[PDB]
Design a protein around this ligand. Sequence first.
Ligand SMILES: Cc1cc2nc3c(=O)[nH]c(=O)nc-3n(C[C@H](O)[C@H](O)[C@H](O)COP(=O)(O)OP(=O)(O)OC[C@H]3O[C@@H](n4cnc5c(N)ncnc54)[C@H](O)[C@@H]3O)c2cc1C
Length: 295
Amino acid sequence: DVPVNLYRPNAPFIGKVISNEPLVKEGGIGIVQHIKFDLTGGNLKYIEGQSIGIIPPGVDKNGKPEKLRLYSIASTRHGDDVDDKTISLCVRQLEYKHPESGETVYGVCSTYLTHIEPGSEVKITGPVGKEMLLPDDPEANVIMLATGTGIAPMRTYLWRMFKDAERAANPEYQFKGFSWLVFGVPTTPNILYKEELEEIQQKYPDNFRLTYAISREQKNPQGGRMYIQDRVAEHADQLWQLIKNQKTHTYICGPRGMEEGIDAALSAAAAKEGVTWSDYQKDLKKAGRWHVETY
Ligand SMILES: Cc1cc2nc3c(=O)[nH]c(=O)nc-3n(C[C@H](O)[C@H](O)[C@H](O)COP(=O)(O)OP(=O)(O)OC[C@H]3O[C@@H](n4cnc5c(N)ncnc54)[C@H](O)[C@@H]3O)c2cc1C
């Protein structure tokens, strides 16, 4: 049922860029772009939580063709225009320190994508992944813990759950549960999709809670910069209580380095009721209710 590998690296789908828009507002750190691709002409279908591969042009330092890089799909199965004709990505331009031969280094595929022009053809593969799928149950609770581009799959979930056009297109999925997004970024201008996320919280105050962890603007009780792990610790008992519900699902996504703090917080909460989080978590993973995609 779940679409998988409709297009593979040896014969990718050739899509066309429709738009490439900035998500980081002035005063923010780095570059993160929302890129929408045209899927007409092919049969690439996908669902929320999946990823697609992008094969950038050029050869590596060894003269070998560049391989695909995976990106979390940022649009619902219907696409941003709810027409089943497109797919979108949330791409950060990778750039780092000097200790890597040279001054500032720029990632190959991410630089290619963030600077791509509308009308350009792109090699797409996939979709792939069955790790971050949303339950079909409209009454399930969904906890979303993300940092930076990890917001991508969360956008697919939230749009499907709360966009007027999505609700009209998905008769069988009228979400009535509770969703809680804890989103961490360095600055307010870095809050990806800020306007729309807050619009959703304003319309669905009882079905969606939005919590931010803005490192350069907030301090945790210890005096350090505020990170998602700090917000999880702050609401550890609540999150644990929600996780105990047989229908609750939790999703973690974004650059690695977030899980350790999250487990420490939940472990302390569960321990108060004589439960070993690490064991409870293993059962949740086995049951398909604890979803993780870090990179
Ligand atoms: C399932 C999955 C989903 C993903 N989803 C997304 C998404 O939605 N959005 C998104 O932007 N990315 C996403 N990523 C990451 C993405 O696939 C690419 O890894 C990333 O975009 C960088 O690729 P590149 O081609 O730009 O870099 P490359 O040109 O391959 O550069 C990366 C390499 O350079 C080195 N490097 C990277 N950072 C540093 C650093 N700070 N210091 C030193 N060396 C470093 C490493 O050797 C790394 O292998 C996802 C990854 C996975 C696995």
